[PDB]
Amino acid sequence: MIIDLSQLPEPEVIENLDFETIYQELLGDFREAMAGEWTAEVESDPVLKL
Amino acid sequence: IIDLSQLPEPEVIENLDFETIYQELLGDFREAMAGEWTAEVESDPVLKLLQLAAYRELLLRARINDAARAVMLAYASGADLDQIGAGFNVQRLLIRPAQPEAVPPVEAQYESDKSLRNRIQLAFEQLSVAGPRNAYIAHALGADGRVADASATSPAPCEVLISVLGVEGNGQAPEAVLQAVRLALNAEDVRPVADRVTVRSAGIVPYQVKAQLYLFPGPEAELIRAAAEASLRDYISAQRRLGRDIRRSALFATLHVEGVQRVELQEPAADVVLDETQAAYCTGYAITLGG
Amino acid sequence: TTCRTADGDMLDSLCYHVYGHLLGCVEATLDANPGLADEQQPFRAGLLISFPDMP
Amino acid sequence: SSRLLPPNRSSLERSLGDVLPAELPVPLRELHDPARCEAALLPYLAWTRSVDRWDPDWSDEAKRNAVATSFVLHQRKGTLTALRQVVEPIGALSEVTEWWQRSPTGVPGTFEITVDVSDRGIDEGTVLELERLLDDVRPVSRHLTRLDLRI
Amino acid sequence: TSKKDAAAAFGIGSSIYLACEAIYNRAQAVIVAVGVETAETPEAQASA
Amino acid sequence: MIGMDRRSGLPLSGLAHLKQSVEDILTTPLGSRRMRPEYGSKLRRMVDMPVSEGWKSAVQAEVARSLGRWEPRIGLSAVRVVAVVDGRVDLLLSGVFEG
Amino acid sequence: AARNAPASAYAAGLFAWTDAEYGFWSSPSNKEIKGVTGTSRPVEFLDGD
């Protein structure tokens, strides 16, 4: 009497990922860390390369 | 059957602090920029990038560790043992499931933690149907209104003495609940072997404890006194879960909470012995303060 | 829809030509591929990436 | 790395592409292979495989085979084959008893076994463990506490 | 043609890699390097 | 807007930040950026195309496109092909200064 | 630490850089050397003397 694997709930450690919810955090971790000394959110600025 | 999820945490990757990660990145950076490093190069925007990068693998050494907890049965949380128990033939069952007697008060309930993991621990003790020491144990934990089992044999061979203990209240388990183990052990035992089923195989002696604790002059003595029984009233029910002994030191360490400088014990003159056969029951406690 | 890479191809460049956008389309490719992330980001000459449908 | 960055890049950005990612090993698949676990976290895996008896004195070649073959030992407890492999660190397989070697219908006790173990590598001690090391393989009432040994 | 090409062809820490290190930081140009073995006396190094 | 210099990390806002963004755009190809396949220029793909009067209509478009997309603080004046020497095409790009 | 370089390879770094930046008709005689951190026997050039 084995249980089929297709009726299990989804686990905790598997995460749907997003590039944006990592990259928009890195904006919101660097902008507050500069204290307004960096304010060029244009993509050609070489902070958005890195 | 001992819970492994009550230990200090194991580190599969080392967990460095923020400062030695930063200087480890700077050293690699100097080697890469060798021949080009200048005082102007280490500017304020560049340094604040490196202070981010020292923090991101501070959250990745914390990511590998927090992932490796929930893979091992040591410190795995809910909705994640279903992936581990499927590897050990463990499916959660229904203990009075969601029957809506009335439709707005929904009453849904599953098996909780720290006992479903125990079944996973006993998963490999359910493979052998030739009856080792634990297969009589690990099949008798299919019921709910009991506690775990212990096996012994004093008489002539193929006479199994199993002690079906049960935690539901004051001692004696009902004989109608005793008949359920033969419904759980029919095609799991060996056929020539024959067991006798004794619920209380040695006897019950009444025990107590009387402790005169001290608290500090300071915070409130209502929630600190009551916090001692939060680690004690679930501890006494876990003693016959392994069938093993209680000590004098069990009556000390389960009463040390935040705000304790010394404790004291008077109820035993000397410690008693409780073997795998011998067990006892605790009737009623009274832990107050001396101050 | 399994495709074969080359030895210098990269993941976000490949699935932009296939899908047309990259919002939610790269990490879904790493999700439905066993051991792709373990492999180095500059892919080897003959690895197989199975691109899923409905990104 | 440097290649990941666009072709037009300074030598400052080319250095930061090797530093700002800062990749790490993920030693997660090695946690469930007993032949590839580290020695510091090996008794975590010995718990979930229900390894009943364990010693912190063996060599690492003698510790990993006790975890890897913990499935086969508990799968067929009654069979002789598991008994052969439960004595793994003590290299010993000489002789096993059976009914018809004794003529008067077995011993009183319905033929509890007196197995043979031969150890030449270690001579000091090694006796007081063997009456309880074989206790988990032994059923509760199919065998009696009679035992034989050999050094 | 590059800073890594001088480290592989003459070794890091050589006296001629340190000269290519001086060039590839300011500029990026083609270097036709010869490279000689270290003579014993400093007077015989000039003859090499 | 205040940004950092590409080499040497120095914070410069007006003069070289407007120059390190335009001069990078003309030689950065499309798809070289990570998760941004539309940043860059087609000027790296304009190499070895035949120099016709329809080719200058594309380069004056791609200068007006790739700078019109990702550099709004630059007003393009004129992209005049002024010399064809040895296959080398001299395109003069005089840009206005803002800020 | 700070070692003494022959300062001849650092001058050829400027002859190769000005030909790529300003052209082969441009003298490298005002351009900056990047890797240095000093100069043995420092020479005097104050403003206009």
XYZ file of C-alpha atoms in Angstrom:
743
model
C 0.000 0.000 0.000
C 2.210 2.801 -1.332
C 1.144 6.432 -1.672
C 1.384 8.076 -5.087
C 3.855 10.961 -5.302
C 1.444 13.170 -7.290
C -0.768 13.848 -4.236
C 1.922 15.383 -1.997
C 1.828 19.095 -1.105
C 4.635 21.329 -2.307
C 7.589 21.570 0.128
C 9.286 24.459 1.937
C 12.805 24.507 0.492
C 11.795 24.691 -3.184
C 11.361 28.366 -4.078
C 10.053 30.039 -7.172
C 12.758 32.545 -8.060
C 12.688 36.033 -9.548
C 15.501 38.100 -11.007
C 13.595 41.293 -10.186
C 12.997 40.601 -6.487
C 16.750 40.063 -6.114
C 17.777 43.029 -8.289
C 15.271 45.497 -6.810
C 16.616 44.575 -3.369
C 20.167 45.343 -4.549
C 18.881 48.758 -5.592
C 17.289 49.138 -2.147
C 20.460 47.964 -0.407
C 22.850 50.296 -2.271
C 20.740 53.470 -2.484
C 20.319 53.734 1.292
C 23.988 52.790 1.789
C 25.220 55.754 -0.284
C 23.130 58.282 1.747
C 22.159 60.123 -1.428
C 25.684 60.362 -2.845
C 24.758 58.064 -5.761
C 21.547 58.982 -7.578
C 21.998 57.952 -11.247
C 19.634 55.019 -11.836
C 20.314 55.181 -15.597
C 21.359 51.740 -16.869
C 24.528 53.181 -18.454
C 25.837 53.996 -14.956
C 28.501 51.343 -14.161
C 26.934 50.522 -10.811
C 24.070 48.850 -12.672
C 26.618 46.806 -14.609
C 27.815 45.350 -11.302
C 13.700 6.836 20.184
C 15.470 10.121 20.969
C 14.682 13.423 19.244
C 17.772 14.715 17.437
C 16.170 18.127 16.728
C 16.957 19.476 20.228
C 20.733 19.879 19.785
C 22.946 22.824 18.814
C 22.881 23.477 15.093
C 25.343 21.746 12.744
C 27.157 23.934 10.220
C 27.664 22.247 6.853
C 29.348 25.371 5.489
C 31.300 27.567 7.893
C 29.484 30.727 8.979
C 31.974 33.591 8.987
C 31.098 37.031 10.324
C 30.854 40.186 8.213
C 34.408 41.446 8.785
C 36.551 38.456 7.768
C 34.428 37.990 4.640
C 35.200 41.598 3.663
C 38.985 41.369 4.044
C 38.964 38.005 2.253
C 37.358 39.721 -0.754
C 39.798 42.647 -0.597
C 42.802 40.302 -0.754
C 41.472 38.630 -3.907
C 40.688 42.106 -5.309
C 44.279 43.309 -4.771
C 45.666 40.266 -6.614
C 43.321 40.927 -9.555
C 44.227 44.642 -9.627
C 47.967 43.987 -9.030
C 49.975 46.722 -10.705
C 46.896 48.972 -10.955
C 45.907 49.633 -7.337
C 45.896 53.288 -6.311
C 44.552 55.196 -3.310
C 42.061 56.855 -5.676
C 40.850 53.397 -6.817
C 39.510 52.592 -3.327
C 36.883 55.316 -3.566
C 33.675 55.600 -1.566
C 31.336 54.126 -4.296
C 33.673 51.157 -4.848
C 33.966 50.422 -1.106
C 30.175 50.519 -0.597
C 29.915 47.947 -3.396
C 32.382 45.740 -1.511
C 30.424 46.211 1.729
C 27.372 44.882 -0.099
C 29.317 41.902 -1.470
C 30.622 41.039 2.004
C 26.956 40.998 3.109
C 25.532 38.946 0.219
C 27.474 35.766 0.975
C 26.799 36.514 4.617
C 23.245 35.747 3.437
C 24.498 32.802 1.352
C 26.448 31.057 4.101
C 23.192 31.555 6.019
C 21.281 30.217 2.991
C 23.247 26.957 2.685
C 22.930 26.359 6.441
C 19.187 27.090 6.559
C 18.626 24.787 3.572
C 20.676 21.951 5.086
C 18.622 22.055 8.289
C 15.315 21.337 6.512
C 16.801 18.394 4.552
C 18.049 16.421 7.562
C 15.447 15.098 10.014
C 17.359 17.076 12.648
C 15.527 20.454 12.544
C 13.047 19.845 9.743
C 9.778 21.780 9.940
C 6.222 21.202 8.768
C 5.101 20.685 5.147
C 8.605 19.306 4.438
C 8.622 15.856 6.092
C 6.156 14.774 3.374
C 9.121 14.824 0.984
C 11.325 13.012 3.508
C 8.679 10.549 4.725
C 7.931 9.572 1.127
C 11.519 8.304 1.094
C 10.730 6.282 4.238
C 7.156 5.085 3.378
C 5.665 7.576 5.859
C 2.325 9.156 4.924
C 0.444 11.388 7.342
C -2.962 10.020 8.353
C -6.169 11.575 9.682
C -6.758 12.003 13.423
C -10.394 13.323 13.576
C -10.237 15.224 10.245
C -12.296 18.137 8.895
C -15.873 16.998 9.329
C -17.955 20.221 9.386
C -20.477 19.536 12.141
C -21.229 23.233 11.702
C -20.043 24.855 8.480
C -18.408 28.190 9.629
C -16.401 26.586 12.528
C -14.009 24.543 10.384
C -12.009 22.031 12.460
C -9.094 20.693 10.406
C -6.298 18.810 12.144
C -3.364 16.611 11.102
C -0.552 14.879 12.960
C 1.774 17.355 14.674
C 5.577 17.359 14.613
C 8.065 15.488 16.900
C 5.997 12.281 16.750
C 5.705 11.848 12.975
C 9.505 12.151 12.824
C 9.674 9.326 15.393
C 7.704 7.095 13.008
C 10.237 7.991 10.282
C 12.955 6.930 12.742
C 11.129 3.598 13.147
C 10.583 3.212 9.370
C 13.572 0.883 8.981
C 12.431 -1.046 12.070
C 9.243 -1.996 10.168
C 10.974 -3.736 7.244
C 11.870 -6.952 9.075
C 8.795 -9.154 9.527
C 10.847 -11.860 11.319
C 10.304 -9.890 14.548
C 13.432 -8.172 15.906
C 13.367 -6.238 19.189
C 11.966 -3.049 17.627
C 9.429 -4.438 15.126
C 7.096 -5.317 17.995
C 7.643 -1.735 19.179
C 7.457 0.076 15.812
C 4.173 -1.603 14.825
C 2.488 -0.980 18.196
C 2.814 2.805 17.690
C 0.080 2.715 15.034
C -2.574 3.505 17.645
C -3.186 6.922 19.199
C -4.501 6.286 22.717
C -1.275 4.735 24.041
C 2.449 5.305 24.502
C 5.426 3.298 23.197
C 6.297 -0.306 24.010
C 9.181 -2.317 25.447
C 10.081 -5.964 24.868
C 11.705 -8.472 27.225
C 11.835 -12.222 27.866
C 12.376 -13.863 31.250
C 10.666 -17.313 30.632
C 11.230 -20.246 28.216
C 11.854 -19.307 24.548
C 9.203 -18.200 22.045
C 7.374 -16.521 24.938
C 7.503 -12.756 24.390
C 6.846 -10.400 27.322
C 5.785 -7.050 25.863
C 4.708 -4.293 28.267
C 1.914 -2.292 26.625
C 2.033 1.022 28.485
C -0.431 3.801 27.769
C -0.491 7.526 28.539
C -4.057 8.775 28.804
C -4.401 9.578 32.521
C -4.248 7.806 35.895
C -2.300 4.645 35.162
C -4.295 1.576 34.102
C -5.008 1.263 30.375
C -8.368 -0.231 29.323
C -8.521 -3.857 28.228
C -10.534 -2.959 25.115
C -7.639 -0.713 24.069
C -5.315 -3.632 24.922
C -6.977 -5.806 22.254
C -5.928 -3.414 19.463
C -2.309 -4.626 19.485
C -3.448 -8.048 18.246
C -5.232 -6.188 15.450
C -1.927 -4.391 14.803
C 0.137 -7.616 15.158
C -1.472 -10.404 13.125
C 0.589 -10.747 9.923
C 3.609 -8.813 11.238
C 4.888 -11.264 13.874
C 6.342 -14.728 13.345
C 3.764 -17.516 13.382
C 5.462 -20.050 15.772
C 6.349 -17.315 18.286
C 3.685 -16.471 20.873
C 3.507 -13.345 23.028
C 1.759 -12.582 26.293
C 0.299 -9.088 26.633
C 0.735 -7.506 30.071
C -0.303 -3.868 30.445
C 1.398 -3.368 33.850
C 4.134 -5.983 34.208
C 5.909 -4.795 37.373
C 3.563 -2.568 39.368
C 2.747 1.093 40.032
C 4.106 3.039 43.009
C 2.891 6.612 43.699
C 5.528 9.340 43.345
C 5.603 13.085 44.035
C 8.080 15.957 44.133
C 8.394 18.871 46.575
C 10.711 21.707 45.515
C 11.416 24.987 47.331
C 12.764 27.178 44.545
C 14.238 30.666 44.893
C 13.737 33.549 42.481
C 15.640 36.830 42.292
C 14.341 40.142 43.683
C 13.104 41.448 40.362
C 10.591 40.210 37.756
C 7.192 38.684 38.455
C 7.025 35.362 40.298
C 3.817 34.206 38.572
C 5.094 33.502 35.049
C 8.550 32.288 36.141
C 7.183 29.733 38.620
C 4.704 28.502 35.985
C 7.463 28.248 33.357
C 9.067 25.425 35.368
C 6.096 23.118 34.725
C 6.122 24.009 31.011
C 9.278 21.886 30.681
C 8.188 19.399 33.386
C 4.575 18.340 32.733
C 5.570 17.193 29.229
C 8.773 15.642 30.639
C 7.020 13.183 32.980
C 4.915 11.853 30.079
C 8.152 11.239 28.118
C 9.783 9.022 30.768
C 7.849 5.805 30.061
C 7.958 6.699 26.348
C 11.405 5.067 26.475
C 10.691 2.920 29.529
C 13.772 4.255 31.305
C 14.683 5.741 34.651
C 14.001 9.021 36.387
C 16.759 10.574 38.468
C 17.248 13.117 41.216
C 18.943 15.301 38.569
C 15.772 15.130 36.455
C 13.995 16.818 39.378
C 16.635 19.584 39.421
C 17.338 20.460 35.770
C 13.676 20.540 34.679
C 13.042 23.308 37.246
C 15.905 25.656 36.275
C 14.341 28.575 34.384
C 15.346 32.211 33.805
C 15.717 33.716 37.281
C 17.040 30.796 39.346
C 20.108 30.898 41.594
C 19.635 27.679 43.607
C 17.191 24.777 43.899
C 16.531 22.069 46.484
C 15.004 18.579 46.707
C 13.525 16.590 49.608
C 11.131 13.970 48.197
C 13.610 11.091 47.681
C 16.027 10.135 50.421
C 17.864 8.060 47.808
C 17.260 7.558 44.104
C 15.124 4.697 42.830
C 15.819 2.361 39.904
C 13.447 1.838 36.958
C 14.618 -0.790 34.468
C 13.151 -1.621 31.047
C 10.558 -3.774 32.854
C 9.992 -1.680 35.994
C 7.925 1.492 35.606
C 6.025 3.878 37.861
C 3.512 6.720 37.769
C 3.462 10.237 39.214
C 0.202 11.279 40.856
C 0.428 14.925 41.892
C 3.092 17.610 42.267
C 3.385 20.828 44.272
C 6.223 23.181 43.277
C 6.087 26.549 45.070
C 8.624 29.187 46.133
C 10.439 29.495 49.443
C 10.595 33.285 49.323
C 11.764 21.055 -26.784
C 15.349 20.099 -25.957
C 18.101 22.127 -27.647
C 21.874 21.655 -27.612
C 24.183 24.501 -26.599
C 27.634 25.440 -27.821
C 30.796 25.910 -25.749
C 30.344 29.678 -25.265
C 26.572 30.044 -25.252
C 24.878 31.535 -22.212
C 21.468 30.945 -20.739
C 19.789 34.365 -20.903
C 20.939 34.871 -24.503
C 19.539 31.505 -25.657
C 16.050 31.764 -24.129
C 15.629 35.329 -25.368
C 15.808 34.097 -28.970
C 13.460 31.215 -28.141
C 10.863 32.928 -25.947
C 11.104 36.639 -26.793
C 11.321 37.948 -23.218
C 13.231 37.185 -20.032
C 10.701 37.946 -17.267
C 10.293 34.672 -15.389
C 11.907 32.717 -18.227
C 15.487 32.065 -17.034
C 14.958 30.715 -13.519
C 12.118 28.554 -14.849
C 14.687 27.096 -17.249
C 17.051 26.430 -14.328
C 14.113 24.943 -12.399
C 13.072 22.387 -15.042
C 16.635 21.195 -15.770
C 18.430 18.701 -13.482
C 21.944 19.827 -12.615
C 22.055 22.789 -15.003
C 22.975 25.338 -12.313
C 25.729 22.997 -11.042
C 27.311 23.276 -14.491
C 29.389 26.423 -15.025
C 27.634 29.451 -16.516
C 29.733 29.356 -19.754
C 28.167 26.111 -20.967
C 30.118 23.192 -22.410
C 30.018 22.280 -26.109
C 27.385 19.560 -25.802
C 25.070 20.027 -22.818
C 21.317 19.562 -23.368
C 18.832 22.172 -22.105
C 15.146 21.228 -22.285
C 13.260 24.508 -22.654
C 9.754 24.167 -21.154
C 6.536 25.378 -22.754
C 4.280 28.248 -21.564
C 6.815 30.550 -19.804
C 33.597 36.376 -14.032
C 35.357 38.759 -16.419
C 33.807 37.047 -19.464
C 30.295 37.508 -18.024
C 30.677 41.300 -18.186
C 30.174 43.110 -21.547
C 33.202 43.459 -23.873
C 33.593 47.194 -23.269
C 34.759 47.178 -19.651
C 37.538 48.685 -17.599
C 40.179 46.720 -15.731
C 38.415 47.830 -12.530
C 35.123 46.197 -13.536
C 37.017 43.162 -14.878
C 38.475 42.654 -11.399
C 35.149 43.221 -9.613
C 33.469 40.560 -11.762
C 35.772 37.982 -10.153
C 35.111 39.358 -6.637
C 31.543 40.664 -6.317
C 29.889 37.264 -7.168
C 32.101 35.335 -4.692
C 30.813 31.823 -5.365
C 30.664 29.179 -2.633
C 30.561 25.373 -2.537
C 27.220 23.685 -1.910
C 28.069 20.425 -0.055
C 24.438 19.274 0.053
C 24.441 16.102 -2.075
C 27.305 14.757 0.073
C 25.104 14.747 3.204
C 23.178 11.597 2.200
C 25.970 9.594 0.550
C 27.678 7.829 3.494
C 30.837 7.209 1.443
C 31.149 10.979 0.842
C 30.111 12.496 4.194
C 32.684 14.373 6.235
C 33.782 12.764 9.498
C 32.486 15.639 11.662
C 28.821 15.233 10.615
C 28.698 11.456 10.038
C 26.670 10.536 13.218
C 23.831 12.757 11.960
C 23.363 10.349 9.032
C 23.757 7.325 11.333
C 20.635 8.404 13.252
C 18.271 8.577 10.260
C 19.468 5.209 8.913
C 18.642 3.757 12.393
C 22.172 2.413 12.927
C 21.563 0.662 16.239
C 25.155 0.280 17.480
C 28.038 2.662 16.849
C 31.571 3.252 18.143
C 33.707 6.447 17.940
C 36.880 4.338 17.684
C 36.766 2.802 14.184
C 38.692 3.834 11.102
C 36.837 5.910 8.516
C 36.773 2.938 6.131
C 35.142 0.992 8.991
C 32.625 3.768 9.746
C 31.173 4.396 6.285
C 30.382 0.765 5.422
C 28.471 0.451 8.719
C 26.127 3.218 7.499
C 25.893 2.214 3.821
C 24.885 -1.391 4.586
C 22.498 -0.439 7.407
C 19.571 -1.009 5.014
C 20.515 -4.592 4.089
C 21.143 -5.555 7.735
C 17.657 -4.527 8.918
C 15.882 -5.780 5.771
C 16.426 -9.499 6.579
C 17.143 -9.763 10.325
C 16.382 -13.495 10.608
C 18.586 -14.581 7.685
C 22.202 -15.655 8.222
C 23.439 -13.226 5.510
C 22.755 -10.194 7.735
C 24.515 -11.918 10.657
C 27.638 -12.302 8.487
C 27.689 -8.543 7.779
C 26.794 -7.251 11.261
C 30.309 -8.309 12.279
C 31.890 -5.897 9.768
C 34.820 -4.167 11.608
C 35.889 -7.417 13.274
C 36.848 -9.370 10.161
C 35.452 -12.777 11.070
C 33.545 -15.477 9.178
C 34.421 -19.018 10.286
C 31.498 -21.277 11.214
C 27.769 -21.263 11.986
C 25.815 -23.880 13.946
C 22.704 -25.823 12.939
C 20.319 -28.378 14.491
C 21.578 -31.772 13.306
C 25.169 -31.327 14.541
C 23.780 -32.053 18.017
C 22.158 -35.490 18.119
C 19.885 -35.378 21.250
C 17.107 -33.143 19.759
C 18.877 -29.864 20.595
C 19.691 -28.128 23.868
C 16.969 -27.287 26.435
C 16.073 -23.865 25.092
C 15.246 -25.002 21.530
C 18.761 -24.419 20.114
C 19.910 -20.948 20.923
C 22.970 -20.222 18.811
C 26.628 -20.205 19.893
C 28.328 -18.413 16.989
C 32.068 -18.301 16.257
C 34.021 -15.032 15.962
C 37.774 -14.931 15.264
C 39.742 -11.707 15.758
C 43.500 -11.439 15.214
C 43.874 -7.686 14.642
C 42.947 -6.652 18.196
C 43.523 -8.840 21.265
C 42.946 -6.437 24.176
C 39.331 -6.319 25.349
C 36.785 -6.957 22.520
C 34.811 -9.549 24.567
C 32.379 -7.473 26.670
C 30.821 -5.888 23.550
C 29.901 -9.064 21.650
C 27.127 -10.186 24.011
C 25.275 -6.887 23.445
C 26.432 -6.065 19.898
C 24.573 -9.171 18.674
C 21.533 -8.341 20.837
C 19.771 -6.232 18.185
C 20.115 -8.961 15.537
C 18.814 -11.486 18.076
C 15.005 -11.764 18.366
C 13.334 -11.197 21.718
C 12.446 -14.811 22.517
C 13.646 -16.978 19.608
C 17.129 -17.159 21.172
C 18.446 -17.436 24.724
C 21.375 -15.729 26.471
C 23.823 -18.619 25.906
C 26.872 -17.467 23.968
C 30.297 -18.706 22.879
C 33.377 -16.694 21.951
C 36.895 -17.091 20.577
C 39.977 -14.869 20.638
C 49.200 40.940 -26.328
C 47.801 40.728 -22.788
C 48.855 40.754 -19.153
C 47.940 37.093 -18.652
C 49.954 36.096 -21.728
C 53.125 37.460 -20.125
C 52.455 35.586 -16.885
C 52.125 32.271 -18.711
C 55.138 32.795 -20.975
C 57.577 34.208 -18.409
C 56.184 33.343 -14.969
C 54.801 35.608 -12.260
C 57.587 37.371 -10.396
C 60.102 37.396 -13.243
C 62.018 40.558 -14.037
C 60.473 40.649 -17.524
C 56.917 39.966 -16.346
C 57.277 42.994 -14.068
C 58.160 45.048 -17.150
C 55.066 43.793 -18.975
C 53.112 44.540 -15.799
C 54.279 48.151 -16.127
C 52.938 48.364 -19.694
C 49.594 46.550 -19.532
C 48.290 48.732 -16.696
C 48.649 52.067 -18.470
C 48.113 50.866 -22.046
C 47.202 47.744 -24.011
C 49.681 47.098 -26.812
C 51.689 44.399 -28.552
C 54.933 43.451 -26.803
C 57.642 41.450 -28.556
C 59.495 40.217 -25.476
C 62.738 38.279 -25.793
C 63.632 37.135 -22.299
C 67.103 35.935 -21.312
C 68.391 33.718 -18.539
C 69.916 35.300 -15.446
C 73.697 35.494 -15.696
C 75.860 34.911 -12.636
C 77.796 38.160 -12.422
C 76.081 41.539 -12.973
C 78.778 42.370 -15.541
C 77.984 39.282 -17.633
C 74.281 40.139 -17.516
C 74.972 43.087 -19.821
C 76.634 40.762 -22.337
C 73.454 38.671 -22.523
C 22.605 62.929 -11.539
C 25.731 61.688 -9.745
C 27.473 58.519 -10.902
C 30.852 56.872 -10.505
C 33.640 56.897 -13.065
C 34.275 53.644 -14.915
C 37.995 53.535 -14.264
C 39.344 54.834 -10.905
C 35.916 54.837 -9.191
C 35.685 58.621 -8.844
C 32.273 60.306 -8.372
C 31.714 62.547 -11.399
C 28.300 63.898 -12.372
C 28.204 66.144 -15.421
C 31.077 65.946 -17.871
C 32.565 62.447 -17.977
C 29.392 60.644 -16.850
C 27.692 61.887 -20.018
C 30.768 60.755 -21.986
C 31.298 57.345 -20.365
C 27.653 56.542 -21.180
C 27.635 57.576 -24.847
C 31.095 56.261 -25.787
C 30.238 52.959 -24.101
C 26.916 52.661 -25.966
C 28.498 52.894 -29.427
C 30.774 49.899 -28.788
C 28.656 47.777 -26.428
C 26.713 45.166 -28.439
C 23.211 43.893 -27.798
C 22.850 40.966 -25.426
C 26.183 41.511 -23.678
C 24.391 42.776 -20.570
C 22.968 40.204 -18.185
C 19.152 39.894 -18.378
C 19.063 43.037 -20.580
C 19.254 41.881 -24.213
C 18.006 45.223 -25.597
C 20.800 47.401 -24.181
C 23.661 48.180 -26.528
C 23.884 49.092 -30.205
C 23.723 47.490 -33.633
C 26.948 49.328 -34.529
C 28.972 46.181 -33.857
C 26.729 44.513 -36.456
C 27.262 47.395 -38.902
C 30.852 46.205 -39.401
C 31.513 44.882 -42.946
C 28.242 46.076 -44.274
C 28.628 47.907 -47.605
C 28.910 51.675 -47.222
C 25.860 52.880 -49.141
C 23.496 55.815 -48.780
C 21.050 53.398 -47.161
C 23.752 52.358 -44.708
C 24.112 55.900 -43.360
C 20.338 55.998 -42.927
C 20.743 53.013 -40.590
C 23.714 54.310 -38.579
C 22.111 57.731 -38.062
C 19.032 55.794 -36.935
C 20.924 53.404 -34.634
C 22.788 56.323 -33.069
C 19.427 58.046 -32.588
C 17.871 54.773 -31.391
C 20.424 53.313 -28.967
C 21.100 56.715 -27.418
C 17.429 57.678 -27.626
C 16.479 54.586 -25.629
C 18.994 54.577 -22.796
C 20.485 58.110 -22.721
C 17.784 60.813 -22.632
C 20.180 63.475 -21.254
C 22.036 63.754 -24.601
C 20.699 65.642 -27.609
C 22.200 64.308 -30.819
C 23.159 66.965 -33.372
C 24.640 65.357 -36.490
C 26.165 62.037 -37.540
C 27.999 62.990 -40.738
C 30.201 60.544 -42.619
C 33.166 62.774 -43.386
C 35.838 60.431 -44.802
C 36.233 56.965 -46.318
C 39.962 56.327 -46.156
C 40.858 52.637 -46.511
C 37.520 51.080 -45.743
C 37.608 53.015 -42.471
C 34.493 55.197 -42.224
C 34.960 58.437 -40.272
C 31.632 59.361 -38.665
C 31.661 62.678 -36.819
C 29.439 62.675 -33.718
C 29.161 66.131 -32.139
C 26.969 65.957 -29.037
C 25.550 68.728 -26.890
C 26.388 69.027 -23.196
C 23.711 69.115 -20.493
C 23.836 69.807 -16.770
C 56.541 46.990 0.097
C 57.694 49.751 -2.244
C 60.329 48.542 -4.710
C 62.411 50.622 -7.102
C 61.447 50.141 -10.746
C 63.722 51.175 -13.655
C 61.054 53.689 -14.892
C 61.759 52.766 -18.528
C 58.867 50.339 -18.937
C 56.515 52.908 -17.399
C 57.495 55.453 -20.045
C 56.758 52.957 -22.827
C 53.348 52.474 -21.257
C 52.706 56.116 -22.143
C 54.095 55.853 -25.676
C 51.682 52.973 -26.257
C 48.766 54.755 -24.584
C 49.026 58.151 -26.287
C 49.162 56.454 -29.683
C 45.864 54.736 -28.887
C 44.255 57.729 -27.137
C 45.708 60.902 -28.680
C 47.613 59.503 -31.658
C 51.201 58.870 -32.711
C 51.752 62.597 -33.367
C 51.075 63.444 -29.712
C 53.848 63.639 -27.166
C 53.424 61.592 -23.964
C 55.244 64.278 -21.998
C 52.364 65.503 -19.836
C 50.417 62.282 -19.251
C 50.020 60.397 -16.005
C 51.753 57.190 -14.952
C 49.264 55.010 -13.118
C 51.113 52.243 -11.290
C 53.623 54.417 -9.441
C 53.578 55.464 -5.794
C 56.627 57.731 -5.663
C 60.000 58.474 -7.200
C 63.555 57.900 -6.009
C 65.363 61.273 -5.647
C 62.281 63.489 -6.185
C 62.843 66.406 -8.553
C 61.599 69.957 -8.031
C 58.996 71.643 -10.253
C 56.996 74.063 -8.141
C 54.895 76.334 -10.344
C 56.783 78.282 -12.993
C 60.400 78.776 -11.932
